[PDB]
Ligand binder design. Structure first.
Ligand code: HEB
Lengths: 587, 570
């Protein structure tokens, strides 16, 4: 009831209502499978009795053989239909869960997305959502088939011989009785074995990622023993659980073997005259005996096939564990207003008692009390981890805040994000080029731009000086994660994208941090000029060239601890002078 | 199929465990077939005998059959699951050890990445599937058909070869036919999955950029369009599995119909078979369970073969460094000398840069100061023998570095890398890495004297590091690298950009930590930061891979060369 295995299994069925139409069709077609199985067994039992007992030649039995062939062809048709319907049930659930996951992930914003590597979000969205398919496509339909076919077998056998129907029905309550004893606790113990297996896989991946450290210390040979010990420890731990978990397989194989033997023994001795019960005082026939024998392995087959689907369920429960907690983590979600910024002129950012909050509730920047007049450029400086980058994300709308942050006297909470972000241009380190071609990436800011405007942007950002080096020129595919372009020229494309449309506010988050010596000289040259056209807020540790910037904010531990122009701060001996001296120690 | 040969060779270890699992799979299937065939014959024989034949009919011998078959089927299934799972965990352990042992000699340069290693781990997981998912069902199906055909030919050769022939013909023809029919769909499926992952990663990583520029909604629209195409390829692949499952039911239908028809005419010489008709039709009914996993097994062979090639492409690379077998004695004092060796890559200079050829006496600290943003330093790699120096020669204690066996080389050189790795194990295991045998208290005093007090505050040495928890910040993570090098206690210490990405407070503490702890060792410290270089006996400043000048910090300022310009804030 309260186990994590049952909690995750309830979650999986809560998502299955997306395709309840498909699961009802599949359950209805499984009921047709049961009827065709019985019609199969009834025709074979009649043909067998005629040839074995009444010695009717096979040339006189074309009607039963013909009907037997149709019920075989119909069975293959229903198996074809159920397999196709089963896929549709899985597909429309995965499509809906993926939409919810991407909705929750777009709406949480880049503040939460960058908390994890993008390959771990791809595991959640691709691998783990797809690990749930076979549970909906195969396992859940097989559960329905395991309680419809066996009861329909019993209903078919019961009129012919109630003793034979009792042999099958007698074993029915014992299998769930085993579930109470073992297999309810073993199922959750197995769920932890699959977690330990995934953790053992991350133990091996950890040793692979650290082979460079293992090499320099000469620990490679002693790390084979750690791989062997961890694997040996996993196997012994898992095999203790499986010695109990595999008892379901054997017990189901025992009760299917006992039922076939009991049906054979009961009918066989009834023919010999030893027994005289169960046949409704009419007489036991070979057709009645064959009908129960053909349908005795069919009574247990849906349950035996359900153990063939154990791993479909086990990997969906493992996937549901990651997807249930993802969908349930509370998130900050900065609230969006309806107000719009009327003018297109540079804004006047004002903040008082402003606290910036991470999507998880953590406070990233303490009390901020700055003021930035229109058209003025300011710089954030400070030690890494002091919350400089968090202030730029609050202004972008990516972070919620407790305080005041007024753009033109209007709180940033009340500004509609769509209208506010059309007055916003941003260049950061680690440029992202989502589009396909280099012309599409630059023109992403506004596709309606004219060719004359585009060429001006490609010239001011110095993109055109490396276009000849590119194979196709401006219409060059950029590649996966800008593989064609080096980081120096990818960042210049981001600069071209930013200055394609002059705006009200320009946010720069260390634009030239890791660029080469040349692109840095051209990225800054373009941004030095751009910063004069509108209100600019830049984050740097390149303190040696801040003379022309009219405001400098020194941020430490989430608050502004110093202010003023470069001339005053460089000689005041405050925290900026310490940072400037530390910066000058670089070559 | 030739690709699986090296992984097939790995099955020699635990050959008995693996073959017992297949034998138990065969015995379980034969017991299922034998139990139904014996029951089908027993009903017919007793019905034909009737009440008058009670005294003549022998039922003690079938009684041992149904008792024996029921026991060997339930015990066979239980132990087939146990033995084949145990064997599957054995082969995974040996696949992991084998892959790790192959990847280790080609560690730094062979692997070139986080996406690669996640794919290497998943490929090893797929090679582990070859036994239960592929080999066990295919071999088990073949032997069951042969045993049934052979055993059932003692009654009639024509009937046995008709049922055995149909089962053999579907075993060998249908899986390749369905593997070929869906190979076109399985390629559009891999292409569409990788395209979706690329569009998803670009949409997630560029979320700040897309939202600001108003494109986040239309780049999710083409992401959903790729998913729709991807789900259309999955639907096509499900329709192929739907066909194979339906055709399997018709082939089983044909065998039953043929046995009903053909055996009615006569079984063996008997033109009036009677009970022997039900023997053949019930064998045909039960025998097709053995072929249930077979087409799905041959599909998974495509994934297993793909992973086997992919792993072999990686572990069959040539290691570019070889180590002798000489049992050299590690010296307590190391004097490194270089001759005509390059400090950094060519960096597209195309100037045929000459070697550095510096000399490090025993006990002396030398700092190599190089321009930021130039060609990346490669002196660390060819001093730990990541790759052999193509030009010049590196002598370690007036002997060539290539003359050291790996055990001695790793023990005479301790390096603190720029990228320090946190293994997921406990804090004690992250330090016992450097020195395998260390007292628990001698281990803890290192954490105190390098300034890592916070790591002994509560969980202490047993605290779980790495991905399990307790991520370390860049400053305290650097002190972990230095703690390992102190525990290793090699005569020569190699520091690569130790004070990079550190605040002035942490940078000063770590530099002072180097001087007092590493006083008696030669350190060759490579940085582009001017801090704390007065302690070093020799400073080597170089531009474009050539020593511009070199000398102690005192006399190096007096010359007013390139170093003096750096001290001017240039
Ligand atoms: C402990 C936990 C676990 C684990 C870990 C595992 C792991 C595993 N596995 Fe397992 N299984 C299980 C638990 C398990 N398992 C179970 C419970 C079952 C059931 C059986 C029956 O029911 O019949 C199976 C069953 C099974 C099978 C049969 C069925 C089907 O068809 O599917 C197989 C083949 C397998 C494989 C396998 C593998 C390969 C592996 C590696 C990864 N599997």
């Amino acid at each position: 009831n309260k186990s994590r295995q049952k909690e995750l299994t309830r979650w999986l069925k809560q998502q299955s209502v997306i395709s309840q139409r498909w699961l009802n069709i599949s359950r209805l077609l499984g009921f047709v499978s049961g009827i065709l199985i019985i019609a199969q067994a009834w025709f074979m039992a009649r043909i067998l009795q005629h040839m074995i007992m009444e010695n009717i030649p096979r040339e006189a039995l074309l009607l039963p053989f013909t009907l037997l062939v149709l019920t075989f062809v119909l069975r293959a048709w229903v198996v074809w239909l159920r397999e196709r319907v089963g896929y549709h049930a899985g597909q429309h659930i995965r499509f809906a869960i993926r939409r919810q996951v991407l909705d929750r992930l777009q709406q949480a914003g880049p503040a939460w997305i960058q908390g994890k590597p993008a390959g771990s979000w791809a595991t959640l969205v691709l691998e783990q959502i797809d690990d749930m398919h076979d549970y909906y496509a195969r396992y859940l339909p097989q559960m329905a088939l395991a309680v419809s076919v066996p009861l329909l077998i019993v209903v078919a056998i019961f009129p012919s011989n109630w003793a034979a129907a009792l042999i099958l029905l007698g074993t029915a309550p014992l299998i769930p009785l085993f579930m109470a004893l073992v297999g309810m606790g073993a199922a959750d113990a197995n769920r932890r074995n699959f977690l330990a297996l995934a953790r053992l896989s991350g133990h091996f991946l950890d040793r692979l990622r650290g082979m460079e450290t293992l090499r320099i210390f000469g620990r490679g040979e002693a790390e084979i023993e750690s791989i062997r010990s961890a694997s040996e420890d996993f196997r012994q731990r898992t095999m203790e659980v499986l010695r109990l978990a595999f008892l379901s397989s054997g017990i189901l194989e025992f009760f299917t073997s006992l039922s076939i033997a009991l049906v054979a023994v009961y009918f066989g001795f009834s023919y010999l005259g030893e027994l005289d019960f169960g046949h409704y005082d009419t007489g036991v026939t070979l057709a009645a005996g064959f009908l129960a024998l053909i349908l005795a392995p069919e009574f247990f087959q849906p349950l035996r096939d359900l153990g063939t689907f154990y791993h479909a369920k086990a990997q969906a429960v493992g996937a549901a564990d990651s997807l249930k907690t993802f969908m349930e983590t509370p998130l900050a979600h900065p609230q969006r207003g309806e107000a719009e910024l009327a003018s297109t002129d540079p804004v006047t950012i004002e903040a008082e008692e402003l606290f910036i909050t991470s999507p998880e509730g953590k406070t990233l920047a303490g009390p901020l009390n700055f003021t930035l007049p229109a058209g003025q450029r300011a710089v954030l400086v400070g030690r890494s981890g002091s919350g400089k980058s968090s202030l730029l994300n609050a202004l972008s709308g990516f972070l919620s805040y407790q305080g005041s942050l007024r753009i033109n006297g209007i709180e940033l909470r009340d500004l509609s994000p769509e209208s506010w972000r059309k007055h916003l241009s941003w260049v950061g380190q680690n440029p992202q080029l989502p589009a396909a071609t280099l012309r599409d990436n630059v023109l992403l800011a506004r596709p309606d731009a004219s060719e004359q405007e585009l060429q001006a942007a490609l010239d001011n950002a110095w993109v055109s000086e490396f276009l000849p080096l590119l194979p196709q020129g401006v219409d060059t595919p950029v590649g996966d994660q800008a593989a064609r372009l080096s980081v120096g020229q990818a960042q210049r494309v981001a600069v071209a994208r930013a200055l394609l449309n002059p705006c009200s506010l320009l946010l720069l988050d260390e634009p030239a941090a890791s660029l080469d010596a040349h692109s840095e000289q051209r990225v800054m040259e373009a941004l030095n000029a751009a910063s004069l056209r509108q209100t600019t807020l830049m984050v740097t540790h390149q303190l040696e060239d801040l003379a022309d910037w009219d405001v400098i904010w020194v941020m430490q531990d989430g608050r502004i601890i110093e202010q003023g122009r470069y001339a005053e701060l460089s000689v005041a001996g405050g925290p900026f002078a310490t940072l400037l001296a530390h910066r000058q120690e670089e070559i | 199929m030739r690709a699986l040969l090296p992984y097939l060779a790995l099955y020699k270890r635990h050959k008995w465990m693996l073959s017992l699992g297949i034998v138990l799979a065969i015995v379980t299937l034969l017991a299922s077939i034998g139990l139904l065939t014996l029951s089908g014959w027993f009903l017919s024989a007793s019905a034909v005998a009737g009440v008058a034949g009670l005294y003549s009919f022998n039922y003690m011998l079938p009684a041992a059959g149904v008792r024996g078959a029921a026991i060997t089927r339930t015990a066979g299934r239980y132990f087939e699951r146990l033995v084949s799972h145990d064997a599957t965990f054995r082969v995974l352990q040996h696949l992991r050890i084998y892959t790790f042992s192959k990847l280790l000699p080609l560690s730094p340069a062979g692997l070139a990445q986080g996406e690669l290693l996640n794919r290497v781990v998943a490929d090893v997981d797929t090679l582990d599937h070859l036994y239960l998912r592929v080999i066990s069902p295919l071999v088990g199906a073949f032997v069951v058909i042969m045993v049934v055909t052979i055993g059932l030919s003692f009654l009639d050769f024509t009937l046995a070869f008709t049922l055995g022939g149909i089962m053999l013909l579907t075993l060998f023809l249908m899986p390749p036919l369905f593997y070929r029919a869906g190979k076109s769909t399985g390629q559009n499926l891999t292409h569409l999955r990788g395209q979706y992952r690329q569009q998803l990663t670009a949409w997630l990583q560029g979320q700040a950029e897309l939202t600001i520029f108003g494109a986040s909604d239309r780049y999710r629209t083409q992401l959903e369009n790729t998913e729709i195409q991807w789900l259309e390829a999955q639907r096509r692949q499900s329709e192929l599995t739907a066909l194979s499952q339906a055709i399997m039911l018709l082939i089983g239908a044909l065998a039953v119909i043929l046995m009903l028809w053909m055996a009615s005419g006569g079984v063996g010489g008997n033109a009036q078979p009677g009970a022997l008709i039900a023997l053949f039709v019930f064998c045909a009914l039960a025998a097709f369970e053995a072929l249930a996993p077979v087409t799905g097994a041959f599909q998974h062979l495509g994934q297993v073969i793909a992973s086997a090639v992919r792993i072999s492409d990686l572990t069959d690379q040539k290691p570019e460094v070889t180590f002798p077998d000489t049992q050299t004695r590690v010296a307590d004092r190391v004097s490194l000398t270089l001759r005509d060796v390059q400090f950094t890559y060519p960096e597209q200079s195309q100037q045929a840069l000459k070697g550095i050829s510096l000399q490090v006496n025993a006990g002396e600290h030398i700092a190599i100061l190089g321009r930021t943003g130039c060609g990346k330093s490669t002196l660390l790699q060819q001093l730990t023998r990541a790759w052999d120096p193509q030009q010049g020669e590196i002598l370690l204690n007036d002997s060539p570095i290539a003359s050291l066996n790996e055990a001695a080389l790793r023990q005479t050189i301790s390096v603190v890398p720029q990228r320090v790795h946190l293994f997921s194990a406990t804090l004690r295991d992250n330090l016992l890495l450097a020195s395998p045998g260390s007292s628990d208290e001698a281990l803890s005093e290192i954490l105190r004297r390098v300034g890592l007090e916070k790591l002994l505050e509560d969980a202490g040495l047993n605290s779980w590091l790495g991905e399990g928890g307790r991520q370390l910040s860049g400053g305290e993570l650097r002190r972990l690298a230095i703690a390992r090098a102190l525990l290793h206690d090699a005569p020569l210490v190699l520091l690569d950009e130790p004070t990079e990405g550190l605040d002035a407070t942490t940078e000063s503490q770590i530099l002072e930590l180097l001087a007092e702890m590493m006083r008696e060792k030669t350190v060759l410290m490579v940085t582009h930061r001017l801090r704390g270089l007065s302690r070093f006996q020799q400073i080597i400043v170089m531009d474009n891979g050539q020593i511009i000048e070199q000398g102690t910090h005192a006399e190096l300022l007096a010359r007013q060369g390139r170093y003096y310009q750096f001290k001017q804030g240039l």
